[PDB]
Amino acid sequence: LANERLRALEDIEREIGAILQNAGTVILELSKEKTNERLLDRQAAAFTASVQHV
Amino acid sequence: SKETLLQSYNKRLKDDIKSIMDNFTEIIKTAKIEDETQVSRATQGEQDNYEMHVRAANIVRAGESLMKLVSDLKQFLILNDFPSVNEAIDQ
Amino acid sequence: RDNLLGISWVDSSWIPILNSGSVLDYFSERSNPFYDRTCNNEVVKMQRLTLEHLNQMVGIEYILLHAQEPILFIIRKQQRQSPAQVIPLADYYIIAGVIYQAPDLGSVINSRVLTAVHGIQSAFDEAMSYCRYHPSKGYWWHFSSIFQRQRVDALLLDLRQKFPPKF
Amino acid sequence: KFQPSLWPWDSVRNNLRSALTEMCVLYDVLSIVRDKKFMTLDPVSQDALPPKQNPQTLQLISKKKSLAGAAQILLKGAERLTKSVTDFNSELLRLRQHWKLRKVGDKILGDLSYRSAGSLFPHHGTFEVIKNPLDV
Amino acid sequence: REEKQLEASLDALLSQVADLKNSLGSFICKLENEYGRLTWPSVLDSFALLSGQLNTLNKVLKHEKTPLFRNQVIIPLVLSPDRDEDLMRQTEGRVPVFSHEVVPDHLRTKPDPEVEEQEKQLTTDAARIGADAAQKQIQSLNKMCSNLLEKISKEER
Numbered sequence: 001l002a003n004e005r006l007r008a009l010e011d012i013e014r015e016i017g018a019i020l021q022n023a024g025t026v027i028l029e030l031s032k033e034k035t036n037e038r039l040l041d042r043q044a045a046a047f048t049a050s051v052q053h054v
Numbered sequence: 055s056k057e058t059l060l061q062s063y064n065k066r067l068k069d070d071i072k073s074i075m076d077n078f079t080e081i082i083k084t085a086k087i088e089d090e091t092q093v094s095r096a097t098q099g100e101q102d103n104y105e106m107h108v109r110a111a112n113i114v115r116a117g118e119s120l121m122k123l124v125s126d127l128k129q130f131l132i133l134n135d136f137p138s139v140n141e142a143i144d145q
Numbered sequence: 146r147d148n149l150l151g152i153s154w155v156d157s158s159w160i161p162i163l164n165s166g167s168v169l170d171y172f173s174e175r176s177n178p179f180y181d182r183t184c185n186n187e188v189v190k191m192q193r194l195t196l197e198h199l200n201q202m203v204g205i206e207y208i209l210l211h212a213q214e215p216i217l218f219i220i221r222k223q224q225r226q227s228p229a230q231v232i233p234l235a236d237y238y239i240i241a242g243v244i245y246q247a248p249d250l251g252s253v254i255n256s257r258v259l260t261a262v263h264g265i266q267s268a269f270d271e272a273m274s275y276c277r278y279h280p281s282k283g284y285w286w287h288f289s290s291i292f293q294r295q296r297v298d299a300l301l302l303d304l305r306q307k308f309p310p311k312f
Numbered sequence: 313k314f315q316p317s318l319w320p321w322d323s324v325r326n327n328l329r330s331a332l333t334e335m336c337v338l339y340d341v342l343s344i345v346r347d348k349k350f351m352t353l354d355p356v357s358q359d360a361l362p363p364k365q366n367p368q369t370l371q372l373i374s375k376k377k378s379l380a381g382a383a384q385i386l387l388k389g390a391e392r393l394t395k396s397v398t399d400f401n402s403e404l405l406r407l408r409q410h411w412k413l414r415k416v417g418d419k420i421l422g423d424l425s426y427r428s429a430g431s432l433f434p435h436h437g438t439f440e441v442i443k444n445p446l447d448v
Numbered sequence: 449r450e451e452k453q454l455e456a457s458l459d460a461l462l463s464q465v466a467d468l469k470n471s472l473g474s475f476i477c478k479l480e481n482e483y484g485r486l487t488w489p490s491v492l493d494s495f496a497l498l499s500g501q502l503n504t505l506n507k508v509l510k511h512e513k514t515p516l517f518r519n520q521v522i523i524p525l526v527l528s529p530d531r532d533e534d535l536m537r538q539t540e541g542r543v544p545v546f547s548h549e550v551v552p553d554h555l556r557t558k559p560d561p562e563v564e565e566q567e568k569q570l571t572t573d574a575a576r577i578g579a580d581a582a583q584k585q586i587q588s589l590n591k592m593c594s595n596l597l598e599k600i601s602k603e604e605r
Contacts, residue, residue: 001138005405008128012121016393019117022078023386029085029592030379032585037592044596048603051074054120079600085379085593087371087586092511092518094255095366096567099374100262101503104269106382108496111273114389115492121280121393125401132404133415142409151558210523216548217527221354233356236521240548248557250353251517253341254461256557257334258506261468262499263563264334268327269495273385275320276488280396281445284488288320316480325479332472339469340539341554342462345522346455347538350546353454353520368582369574375589 014054021047059130066123073116077109150248152178160242168218168239169209179237179244181205200228216241403446413441422448454515464509468502524551 025043028034084102131138154177163171172180173190181187186207189198199206203225210219222234236247275287318325344351407413413422424437439448475494479486510517529547536543543550558564 001142001405004131004135005128008124008131012124012397015117015120015124016390016397018074019114019386019393020390022074022113023383023390025596026081026379026383026386029589030376030383032376034588034592037588040592041595041599044599047078048600051071052603054071075600075604079597081382082593082596082600085375086590087368087375090367090371092251092514092516093507094252094259095370095374096563097255097259097262098507099370099378100259100266101507102375103378103381104262104266104499104503106378107266107269107273107385108492108499110382110385110389111492112496113386115489117389117393118278118280125280128401129404129415132401132408133413133420139408148558211525213527217524219523233354234358236354236356236523238523240527240552243552245552245555247521247523248555249356249358249518250345250520250522252557253522253555254338254517256559257338259559259563260334261331262503263560264327264331265495265499268324268331269499271327272321272324272491272495278392278396278488281400286320286488318480318483321479321483325476328472328476328479332469332476335465335469335472336542337554338465339462340543341522342458342465343539344535344543346458346462350524350526350535351551352523352525354523355519356521357519364571364574365578365582368586369578370570372582372585373570373573 011054014050018047018050018054021050056134063123063127063130066119070116070120070123074113077113077116081106081109146178149179150246150252153243153245154179155243157242163242165209165212165218168220169207171239171242172207172220172237172244177244179246180207200225203227205234220244399445400443404441407441407446450515454520457509457514457517460509461506464502464506468498468506471498471502522555527551 021043025040025047028036028040028043034040084105090098156171156174159171159174169186173186175182184207185199185202185204188202189195205222205224208221208223208231210221212218216239218239220237220239222237224232224234226232237244238247239245277285277287315322315325341351345353404413407422411422411424412428413420415421420441422437422439422441424439425431425433425435427433427436441448475498478494527546527548529545531545535546
């Protein structure tokens with residue numbers, strides 16, 4: 001009972017994480033200099049992994 | 055029917071994921087800088103700003119719809135997932 | 146000089162003297178920002194012979210297109226390369242002795258759609274401010290019958306008949 | 313000065329109707345351009361010199377500002393979700409753990425009678441569940 | 449030949465502007481007569497469909513295979529101060545007496561002074577870093593943006 005419901009709670013938190021990863025990726029792209037392009041790739045993979053497992 | 059409701063839930067999930075992906079990809083594509091021809095820099099820039107803001111609003115709306123889907127699925131599970139009603143009754 | 150389209154040029158003392166050639170004289174008193182000082186037409190006006198000095202002195206000339214007698218005289222500017230070789234530079238139509246440069250077909254649509262996107266942008270960014278969300282509440286803005294009434298209703302109809310309303 | 317009873321959402325209507333006026337200006341000017349009478353077209357070859365490198369720098373600063381606003385609305389919605397999740401369906405958990413419930417239409421009802429427990433009493437105990445966190 | 453292309457461009461762009469006009473009118477009359485029960489999804493949907501469809505369609509019909517619209521210049525033939533009912537029937541329920549005021553009202557390319565002050569501020573911001581950091585930022589942005597679209601187009605498979 002707590003199992004499937006806690007799964008639903010986790011998917012709530014991961015929808016929040018998906019929106020925050022979208023926002024962080026365009027945050028890094030809006031920078032005048034964005035040196036951590038590897039971190040941009042990491043945030044992009046994080047975004048797509050979040051959407052996919054949701 | 056129950057089948058119809060489950061199908062509708064599947065349709066909503068597919069639509070929300072598709073919308074988030076499409077809006078993000080379209081924002082990234084507009085983010086490309088291109089050389090201008092017959093677009094008048096100022097007008098092109100305001101149109102691009104409006105497009106980005108509207109797409110971000112659409113992404114947020116899709117996230118709210120996904121929250122609504124999760125809530126509806128939770129309600130369905132609490133109301134008619136027969137095993138857990140049986141374990142609750144027995145306990 | 147930055148935007149020639151946004152300027153206006155008049156002379157009010159030369160308004161009641163307005164005839165066909167006097168449109169181009171009106172155009173050539175002095176100090177019009179549109180009309181050039183280094184035009185050939187000034188050199189035409191310097192010595193003499195305004196009949197053929199548009200043509201023998203090759204360059205930018207200012208050719209009047211269409212004549213309406215009270216207010217509308219269309220002055221067009223062209224570059225010549227020879228006699229009977231006419232190439233358009235710019236257009237200048239007069240209205241009540243007021244010259245306006247004729248805008249291009251592109252720039253008017255661009256300016257209007259610029260105002261379009263600006264206005265809808267302000268409207269949308271206002272509308273985005275009002276909406277407040279909660280998952281429990283949803284969205285919002287920042288601004289019985291006991292079923293024995295069939296019998297009571299039939300009794301009401303019998304009361305309507307037995308006692309009618311009277312205005 | 314009075315309008316069909318719209319005292320909120322007036323400024324959005326002002327901006328939208330200003331857009332409607334200039335769009336009617338565009339329809340007007342291209343229609344009167346489209347007929348030969350009252351307005352005409354002349355093909356002119358004219359050229360302009362850009363005084364500064366406008367597409368590079370203007371596209372740069374405008375796209376950084378646009379991406380700034382987009383990230384602002386996105387991250388504002390994100391933190392709204394964070395504060396938004398940090399109660400109805402937990403009470404539905406407890407209520408279903410004690411009582412017998414079902415859903416018809418959009419309505420969520422429950423049985424109050426002992427007809428599950430064996431009584432043939434001709435009275436149904438249907439109580440409604442009403443979100444108000446929860447009420448019956 | 450090219451005049452037929454100009455006529456096709458004028459008809460198609462008048463079509464797109466007419467669709468945007470009807471969309472704006474439907475949205476404003478919906479806001480007026482439909483003021484109640486109006487959720488933020490409804491107005492986001494209308495804003496998105498209106499601006500997305502009509503701005504993108506105007507841009508794509510403005511920037512492919514078209515004659516240069518700087519080349520055509522708008523000039524009037526006549527100015528006759530009389531109530532022309534054919535003009536009233538042409539321009540749709542608008543455009544009173546064809547006189548000295550309407551063409552000086554319409555051929556106006558000075559924008560509002562607010563966006564003119566905005567343009568002054570853009571030229572002020574243009575006075576900053578240029579032609580090395582500018583080219584560097586353009587190239588890096590295009591590279592990383594193509595990289596992200598490549599990532600998403602790969603993962604979509």
